[PDB]
RNA sequence: UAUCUACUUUAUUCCUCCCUGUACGAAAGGACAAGAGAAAUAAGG
RNA sequence: CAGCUG
RNA sequence: CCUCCGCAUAAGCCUGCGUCAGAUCACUGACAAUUAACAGCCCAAUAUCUACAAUCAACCAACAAGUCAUUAUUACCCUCACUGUCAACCCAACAGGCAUGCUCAUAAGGAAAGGUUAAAAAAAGUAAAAGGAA
């Protein structure tokens, strides 16, 4: 089950705040996390 | 006439006297190394 | 089926049982008294008395010095085996060690034993004494011995 | 296989309380005459053996101080001496381990 | 990975030989039984 | 085929 | 007695066997630590230059055709900041995996046995008469 093979470049480039804001869909991802009330909106 | 073995530590035990004896067998390889490239190859190879 | 199998199988092989026993025998030549678990002690007791019988064969004997060289892992004890232990027991022919039981080990509850070499400088063990000759039964039997001596 | 039914506490109590599983009342147990703490026959007294063990511990410490370093087994027999005891005529040519307490009643 | 039931020390045969190449048959043929053997299996050591 | 091997 | 392991860097992890104290096969609280030279973090424009692999490179040998470069003018004077530095560590599993440099049996790292007995059955290893795939 070693599917997760970590690096921080792939993690921030995949799921960070800047990639989330880069598209309208990702902005809606942030907005759903902000509305659920989450502590981490992103990586 | 009594052939007592020498009172030394052992070469293979997990003690602290035995380690010093292993240090002496390494150094004994340096003393018996002929050319200076051989001696300097022994004195520098273990990179710590 | 183990009829007439005389050796405990120990350690993790035959070689390893001989190295366990060799460490116990080395401990007992050095310190002259050992606590160790019981089965290990009586196995090693057999080896210990034989080792003195090789110590009495003289320092100058080659075979004795080979056996002492194997069996004593610390080499300073080989002068001790040929100048302290073997001169000590030069009179008696057997019975160099005594073995008793300790209470069981606190850790894993193993049957424990002490062997010492007889006649060592260490404080003596609380040896199990026979009952006194002046007790009731021993005086009745002493009287009976006096009567059967009076038959002659 | 796996159990077909669940065993009941009546069956279980009959299993784990029959005398093959109970602790046997043992009767080896005596009183050590020297110390009065109860010992077992065929086994040394725990208390008196603890006495002897502690005194061999001090004696072996002073053996270690007089030897100094490993591989110093003497070729000489040893004698333990306590405070205010001359080495005997028999104790000559034996290394001497002086102690700081009195000679015990049981060491001799 | 065994819970329950049940359970866990109830002498044959072949070949040879003899009797006998007799009995029986009338010639061909040809016994049994019992005995000795040698084997083999099974059972118990 | 010959060889070896519980 | 083992050592097919080690020691470093990388990636990862983020205080995870430092000291003091305490509760708990036999973690909690307090305090303290990793000091830059190694490594990250670079670059003034505008033009204009960059045909001839590497391979002990010498020839020889080739094809699949290759990993490395400036000049012209203009501007330019202050200087050593910031960050990483610990550990017995990671991804899994409730076996395995892991880049690179050195050491190639070790100067480094470790322990297969809680105690006993020595039944069956099972696993693995060794030995086996005669025979030799029956
Ligand atoms: Mg530098
Ligand atoms: Mg470091
Ligand atoms: Mg080591
Ligand atoms: Mg075992
Ligand atoms: Mg076990
Ligand atoms: Mg099998
Ligand atoms: Mg064979
Ligand atoms: Zn007592």
Which of D56, B13, B43, A33 is CA-nearest to residue C23? B13
Given its phi and psi angles, is residue C11 left (phi above 0), alpha (psi -120 to 50 degrees) or beta? left
d(CA C126, nearest CA chain D) in Å: 7
- Going C39 to C42 to C43 to C44, the CA torsion angle's sign is positive
CATH number of the domain at C70, please: 3.90.1030.10
CA distance D24 to D27: 9
Mutate to test the interface with C, among D49, D78, D87, D107 (most CBs of C within 10 A): D49
Structural domain boundaries of chain D? 27-108
Torsion of CA D62, D65, D68, D70, to 10 degrees: 40
- Neighbour tally for D15: CB within 10 Å: 11
Q: Is the Cβ atom of C102 within 7 Å of strand G at any atom?
A: no
Which domain does A29 fall in, by range?
1-43
Q: Are C121 and C33 in contact (CB under 8 A)?
A: no
Q: Is C132 part of a structural domain of the chain? A: no
Beta-carbon-side half-sphere exposure of residue D2 (alpha carbons within 13 Å): 0
CA distance C70 to C1: 33
Q: Is the Cβ atom of B22 within 7 Å of strand G at any atom?
A: yes
Helix, strand, coil fractions of chain A, as percent rounded to 5: 65, 0, 35
Residue of D nearest to C114 (CA): D44
Q: Is C100 part of a structural domain of the chain? A: yes
* Both tokens assigned to A33: 């996390």
d(CA C56, nearest CA chain B) in Å: 14
| DSSP assigned state of D104 | P
Enumerate residues 34 to 63 of chain C having a beta carbon within 8 A of any beta carbon in chain B: 59-60, 62
Which domain does C71 fall in, by range?
10-120
CA distance C69 to C77: 10
Residue of B nearest to D69 (CA): B17
Phi, psi (rounded to 5 degrees) for C119: 70, 65
Nucleotide nearest to A1 (CA to C1'): G92
Q: Is C97 part of a structural domain of the chain? A: yes
What 3-state DSSP class applies to D97? strand
Q: Is C62 part of a structural domain of the chain? A: yes
Phi, psi (rounded to 5 degrees) for D59: -65, -40
What 3-state DSSP class applies to D39? strand
CA distance C49 to C29: 11
3-state SS, B1-48, equals: CCCCCCCCCCCCCCCCHHHHHHHHHHHHHHHCCCCHHHHHHHHCCCCC
Q: Is C152 part of a structural domain of the chain? A: no
3-state SS, chain C, equals: CCCCCCCCCCCCCHHHHHHHHHHHHHHHHHHCEEEEEHHHHHHHHHHHHHHHHHHCCCCCCHHHHHHHHHHCCCCCHHHHHHHHHHHHCCCCCCCCEEEEEECCCCCCCCCEEEEEECCCCCCCCCCCCCCCCCCHHHHHHHHHHHHHHCCC
Distance C135 CA to ligand 7 centre (A): 70
* C62-71 and C14-31 helices, crossing angle to 10°: 100
CA gyration radius, chain A = 12
- Neighbour tally for B33: CB within 10 Å: 15
Number of domains in chain C: 1
CATH number of the domain at A29, please: 1.10.287.3980
Q: Are C115 and C99 in contact (CB under 8 A)?
A: yes
Q: Is C71 part of a structural domain of the chain? A: yes
CA distance D52 to D44: 11
Residue C123 and residue D48: Cβ atoms within 8 Å? no
Which of B34, B30, B35, B32 is CA-nearest to residue B46? B30
CA distance C83 to C55: 9
Q: Is C77 part of a structural domain of the chain? A: yes
Q: Are C34 and C27 in contact (CB under 8 A)?
A: yes
For residue C44, CA distances in Å to A26, B20, C22, C94, D12 come to 77, 31, 8, 15, 45
Q: Which of C84, C102, C103 sits opposite D75 (nearest CB)?
A: C84
- Secondary element (H or E) of residue D96: strand D95-98
D70 has a chain B CB within 8 A of its CB? yes
- Going A11 to A16 to A21 to A25, the CA torsion angle's sign is positive
D59 has a chain C CB within 8 A of its CB? yes
> At what resolution in Å was this solved?
2.4
Number of domains in chain A: 1
CA distance C145 to D82: 44
Q: Are C74 and C30 in contact (CB under 8 A)?
A: yes
């Amino acid at each position: 089950g070693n599917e997760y093979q970590p690096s921080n470049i792939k993690r921030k480039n995949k799921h960070g705040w800047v990639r989330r804001l880069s598209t309208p869909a990702g902005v809606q991802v942030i907005l759903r996390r902000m509305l659920k009330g989450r502590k981490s909106l992103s990586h | 006439v009594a052939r007592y073995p020498p009172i030394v530590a052992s070469m293979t035990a997990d003690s602290k006297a035995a380690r010093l004896r292993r240090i002496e067998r390494w150094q004994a390889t340096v003393h018996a190394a002929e050319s200076v490239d051989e001696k300097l190859r022994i004195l520098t190879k273990m990179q710590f | 089926i183990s009829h007439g199998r005389v050796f405990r199988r120990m350690g993790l092989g035959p070689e390893s049982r001989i190295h366990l026993l060799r460490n116990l025998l080395t401990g007992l030549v050095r310190h002259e008294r050992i606590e160790a678990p019981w089965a290990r002690v009586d196995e090693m007791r057999g080896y210990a008395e034989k080792l003195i019988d090789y110590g009495k064969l003289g320092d100058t004997n080659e075979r004795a010095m080979r056996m002492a060289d194997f069996w004593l892992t610390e080499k300073d004890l080989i002068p001790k085996l040929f100048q302290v232990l073997a001169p000590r027991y030069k009179d008696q022919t057997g019975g160099y060690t005594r073995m008793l039981q300790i209470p069981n080990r606190s850790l894993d509850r193993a049957k424990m034993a002490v062997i010492e070499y007889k006649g060592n400088c260490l404080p003596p063990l609380p040896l199990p004494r026979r009952d006194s000759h002046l007790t009731l039964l021993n005086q009745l039997l002493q009287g009976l011995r006096q009567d059967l001596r009076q038959s002659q | 296989a796996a159990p077909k039914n669940r065993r009941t506490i009546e069956v279980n109590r009959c299993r784990r309380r029959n005398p093959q599983k109970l602790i046997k009342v043992k009767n080896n147990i005596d009183v050590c005459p020297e110390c009065g703490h109860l010992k077992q026959k065929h086994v040394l007294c725990a208390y008196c053996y603890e006495k002897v063990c502690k005194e061999t511990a001090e004696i072996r410490r002073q053996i270690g101080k007089q030897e100094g370093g490993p591989f110093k087994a003497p070729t000489i027999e040893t004698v333990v001496l306590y405070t205010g005891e001359t080495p005997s005529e028999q104790d000559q040519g034996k290394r001497i381990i002086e102690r700081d307490r009195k000679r015990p009643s049981w060491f001799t």
